Amino acid sequence: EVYLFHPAQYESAPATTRPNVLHYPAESTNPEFKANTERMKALTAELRRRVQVIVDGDSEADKRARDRHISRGKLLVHQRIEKLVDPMSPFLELSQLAGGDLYPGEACHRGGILTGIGVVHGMRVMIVANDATVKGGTYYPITVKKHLRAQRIAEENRLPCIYLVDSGGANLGMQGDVFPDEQHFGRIFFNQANMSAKGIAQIATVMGSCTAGGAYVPAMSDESIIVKGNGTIFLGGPPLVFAATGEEVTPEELGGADVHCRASGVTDYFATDDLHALYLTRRIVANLNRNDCERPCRGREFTPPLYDPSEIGGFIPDMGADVVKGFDVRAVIARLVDGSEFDEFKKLYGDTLVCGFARFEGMLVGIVANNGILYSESALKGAHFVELCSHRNIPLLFLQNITGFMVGKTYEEGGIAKNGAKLVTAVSTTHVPKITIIIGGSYGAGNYGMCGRAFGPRFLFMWPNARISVMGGNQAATVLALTNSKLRENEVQDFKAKVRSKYEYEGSCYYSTARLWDDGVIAPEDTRAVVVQALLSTLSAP
Amino acid sequence: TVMGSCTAGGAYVPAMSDESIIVKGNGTIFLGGPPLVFAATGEEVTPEELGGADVHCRASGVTDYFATDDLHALYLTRRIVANLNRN
Amino acid sequence: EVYLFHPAQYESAPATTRPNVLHYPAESTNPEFKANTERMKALTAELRRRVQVIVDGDSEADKRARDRHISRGKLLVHQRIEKLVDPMSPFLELSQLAGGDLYPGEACHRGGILTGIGVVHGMRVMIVANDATVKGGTYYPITVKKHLRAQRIAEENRLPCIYLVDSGGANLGMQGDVFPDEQHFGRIFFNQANMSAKGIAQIATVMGSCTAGGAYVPAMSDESIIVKGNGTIFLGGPPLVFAATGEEVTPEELGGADVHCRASGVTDYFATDDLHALYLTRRIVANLNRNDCERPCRGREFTPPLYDPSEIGGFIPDMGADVVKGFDVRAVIARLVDGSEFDEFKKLYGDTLVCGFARFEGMLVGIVANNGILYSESALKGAHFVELCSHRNIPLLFLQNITGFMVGKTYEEGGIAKNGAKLVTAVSTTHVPKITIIIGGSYGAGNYGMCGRAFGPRFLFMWPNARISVMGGNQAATVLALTNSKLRENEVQDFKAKVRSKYEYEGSCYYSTARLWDDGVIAPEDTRAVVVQALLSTLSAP
Amino acid sequence: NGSASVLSPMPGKVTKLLVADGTLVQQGQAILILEAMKMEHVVKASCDGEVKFCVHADGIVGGSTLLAHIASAA
Ligand SMILES: *C(=O)CCCC[C@@H]1SC[C@@H]2NC(=O)N[C@@H]21
Numbered sequence A, C: 001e002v003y004l005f006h007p008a009q010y011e012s013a014p015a016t017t018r019p020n021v022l023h024y025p026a027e028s029t030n031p032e033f034k035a036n037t038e039r040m041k042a043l044t045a046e047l048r049r050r051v052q053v054i055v056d057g058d059s060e061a062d063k064r065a066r067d068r069h070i071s072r073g074k075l076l077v078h079q080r081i082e083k084l085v086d087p088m089s090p091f092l093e094l095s096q097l098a099g100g101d102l103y104p105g106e107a108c109h110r111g112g113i114l115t116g117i118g119v120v121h122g123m124r125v126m127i128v129a130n131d132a133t134v135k136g137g138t139y140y141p142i143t144v145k146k147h148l149r150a151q152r153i154a155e156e157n158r159l160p161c162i163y164l165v166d167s168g169g170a171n172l173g174m175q176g177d178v179f180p181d182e183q184h185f186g187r188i189f190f191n192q193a194n195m196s197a198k199g200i201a202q203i204a205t206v207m208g209s210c211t212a213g214g215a216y217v218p219a220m221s222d223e224s225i226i227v228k229g230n231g232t233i234f235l236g237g238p239p240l241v242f243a244a245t246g247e248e249v250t251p252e253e254l255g256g257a258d259v260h261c262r263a264s265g266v267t268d269y270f271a272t273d274d275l276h277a278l279y280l281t282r283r284i285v286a287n288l289n290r291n292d293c294e295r296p297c298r299g300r301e302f303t304p305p306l307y308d309p310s311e312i313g314g315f316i317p318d319m320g321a322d323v324v325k326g327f328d329v330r331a332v333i334a335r336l337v338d339g340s341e342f343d344e345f346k347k348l349y350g351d352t353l354v355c356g357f358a359r360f361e362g363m364l365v366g367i368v369a370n371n372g373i374l375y376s377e378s379a380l381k382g383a384h385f386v387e388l389c390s391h392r393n394i395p396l397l398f399l400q401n402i403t404g405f406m407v408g409k410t411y412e413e414g415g416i417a418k419n420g421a422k423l424v425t426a427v428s429t430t431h432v433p434k435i436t437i438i439i440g441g442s443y444g445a446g447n448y449g450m451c452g453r454a455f456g457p458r459f460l461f462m463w464p465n466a467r468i469s470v471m472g473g474n475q476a477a478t479v480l481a482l483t484n485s486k487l488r489e490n491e492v493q494d495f496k497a498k499v500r501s502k503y504e505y506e507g508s509c510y511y512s513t514a515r516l517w518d519d520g521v522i523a524p525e526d527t528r529a530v531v532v533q534a535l536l537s538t539l540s541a542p
Numbered sequence B: 001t002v003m004g005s006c007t008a009g010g011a012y013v014p015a016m017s018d019e020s021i022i023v024k025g026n027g028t029i030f031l032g033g034p035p036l037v038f039a040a041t042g043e044e045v046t047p048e049e050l051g052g053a054d055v056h057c058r059a060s061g062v063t064d065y066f067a068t069d070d071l072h073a074l075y076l077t078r079r080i081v082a083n084l085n086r087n
Numbered sequence D: 001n002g003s004a005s006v007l008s009p010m011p012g013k014v015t016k017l018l019v020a021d022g023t024l025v026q027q028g029q030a031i032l033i034l035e036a037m038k039m040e041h042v043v044k045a046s047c048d049g050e051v052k053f054c055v056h057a058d059g060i061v062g063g064s065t066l067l068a069h070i071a072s073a074a
């Protein structure tokens, strides 16, 4: 009657009796649940609408530019992606909404450049394609930043790089923010050379023009392709050669496909059109002597989550509010991991930082999620869990909804700064792949403790409800009002409203996305899918 | 070497270092400043009794060397450098 | 008037004003100081007397054995050491008082074997010499243990091994404790082979007999020497060959120098006498192609301690007492380190564990010393200091006077076991050389936290006043009396006296030394010298 | 335990009692909401039974202040 079973029986049990299964059914009849669902639905609809208007174009200027692009026999950038990748395969486009409201007077769609992780011949590659319909493809500062981010991801994951080049060059209006610096246009060539030296293949396909500095992109690649009609490569353009020597030459006879493919030797493959160029790119990828898999083990015997992700938004409260309600992040985890199974690490110690083990399509992942205010115990627990995962080469997944640490004389006397430092050190010095998602708010040093942008996660994504700031909007308003003794009592509400509006504007997901502070905004229900793709991208890492 | 104040994120600089020094009068280390603690819990505390040298050098353990003034702090810094076993 | 000087002025200042100089003058007029001095003087006199009677022999049986040994043309073991090492050089003899009162009825002087670190041709070597005047040189269990300890020290410090072999073999009376086990007679040959494979030279000089297993010692060495008259090597002795085949052969014609040096080829050098054998040993050492120094930097610009070590005993109270007084260990440190200079690590945090940096003859060393009861803060401080020294490749020096941790519900709730574990892990997993000296008492898990015998220090020495036990004598008496409910009130004092006497007997320095629990007992005033020698022995480590 | 005399985690204001007085609540079930630092913290029942509140709503509590009693109703 006592100790009759065997623990393996509980390990292999139906979901009702399996003890490591999270049970968080949706309270669909609760009015707060319905309000949260409506808010999340509106946010996700707005996100999809913005992505769709970027893809299809909105203004008449976009239509004219696309008509000019098509009339030249050119494929659109997303069409080039569709016809370069394997026909039925995922594509992880990273910074979809970059450049949104970033430069006044310009609709810098996608930042003028499309970056993503695609699958060619079964191999994951990083594709960087210039959008010639955005100011002729000229590089804005955000364009350079996005290109560098794509190169960084590819280098740290050993993903071969494919550059579909169609760009006028750096824009001379903002040359101060584009040409001279460490993280500027020359860093592209620095990264390209260093990746080529490390055995990571660099492929360039010149679908259009590349002028001045951009001309280094085809020349510094391991293999390059140039299209006959539209492909031109030269360090000095026809205006420069005319202003220098007084000679008039067309771009075709200056740096066309014939001169660079028959005489110069800069390019290696002659493409008749865009489709032939993409075929040649696929042929180049096919002949990379990269092994299919170091370990032939599959391990694809996984079970989908037991709860529908579509109701995740029901559990997500309004982050922008006078008093922000709390929720259990486990209800989110139950809708993202295999079989809703989750082995919690220290269930009774942290109590505000949930640390545990889970699986995404059979891939074991350590999950660190915020569940309230960070304490010394929670920081110690997080640091210990990160060390434990690092010693086992287990990738880490951070779910950030953080509003700083606990304040007070007792907590500082107990050494909360030291424990936060321990957590930060553990996160910073680990070598396992790290993926972070901002599901709630990321404010202040707590962000630093939860693998923020500065701590080199492989990928970082934000939900449409997420807010990122140095401090919370209400906290900023209260602290600034209290500190500013010059402010009169008659002008308190206006000051608080102004600072709250500024923090709401600069903390929104779109504000962060337009500045490459994250790797895109994703819907909560797609979160699991995104994670899986990201994890797969890290499988080729050394 | 904490010659002055380090608040919020800056407080990580002393805590993440191999060895740290804090000056008695002017050295303060805390993640949350007195304005923040008052706006949160309604309590008034001076920076010295919140994150002063005594609390971080006798009880907290964040800092390793107690400096009486700037000159003593620089002397302790030189002493730390002297004991790096670098050939 | 404010900030007039430069910190380098305080760094280079007379001892009165240099701020990192420990000032602990002796209170020579204090009666307690005089009593402590008298106790320490008596203990050190007893130690020297025991060493002297071991060297010169006490009983008439020792005199007869030495007369037989000399009449054979053999040098005594200490004389062999004196004539093998460079004429004016230090020799660190390790287990001087091993085998003391260990086996009833036998005066196993030095455990039947002398082990030490000497200097030959300017190179530090490990010398292991059998004492044929102790039961004919037969290996007691303590003899095997001491030989293995010498081999371990030599292997971990890359000291070439010299074995002066004169031994009948394992004693058959205690063969159960000598022949079969991991840490038994065959482990000598295992260590010899593994050291030879690692490039550590193994040299054997057969001054006498080596029978059965001992015959492997010359045969498994890189180079071997055998003396003509007294050297015999054979796996089967004349008694065995007569009991087997019925043939009578003398040891000389069975395994003498001629057969093993002209026909067998087991030995490489033919020695006419002991002096020629030692000369050939020196010649072998001379031709080890070992570089004089990896770095020719000297760094010998050091200053002796500013206080006389001869008064250290004045600060040392009576460890065996009903209530043990406390003292400042810094007063000891001021009499051991260069210029009495000591940079304390966390002067105000631990307050019971003194951690700091010092120098011994110019060699930088981290010192961890006990100064009271271990707390969570003290354990954390010790662990952090050990990590700091490990990251800098700074050798560690532990000064143990420990009586366990702080007990209580609050301290256990605060996680004192976790912090003690952190300290133990830091001590165990470090790779820098560690030297520990028991200056006071080492009791229980605190011993484990302070680099005890089980945690692989390079060397471990005990002062003559030191006591080592699982718990203190008073603590053992009180706890055993309280726990034992069977004990009657009429029989309490006798039980406490008996357990106190047992713990005093089994915790004494001589009891520990006879069992190879340490590397010898040293006087406090010699402590600095010993440390220096030990540190030098670690300079050839990889 | 059959009584479950829980204490407040930090000073704050009790905003709303999520369950009426004398109501049966299961383990891990919310009984009241505590607001501090403009953050909603919800107090949960630690065992099954009828919950009776001790502190009035829309007030203020201190560190380790008793909130409610959870008596296992037969
Ligand atoms: C009002 O919005 C300000 C209240 C204080 C905000 C709280 S204090 C504890 C958390 N840490 C932090 O930085 N902010 C949070």
Ligand SMILES: *C(=O)CCCC[C@@H]1SC[C@@H]2NC(=O)N[C@@H]21
Pocket: C373, C403, C404, C405, C406, C407, C444, C472, C473, C474, C475, C476, C478
């Ligand atoms: C009497 O001799 C027993 C008193 C307890 C001894 C104390 S308690 C704190 C220290 N830790 C330990 O193990 N012994 C010491």
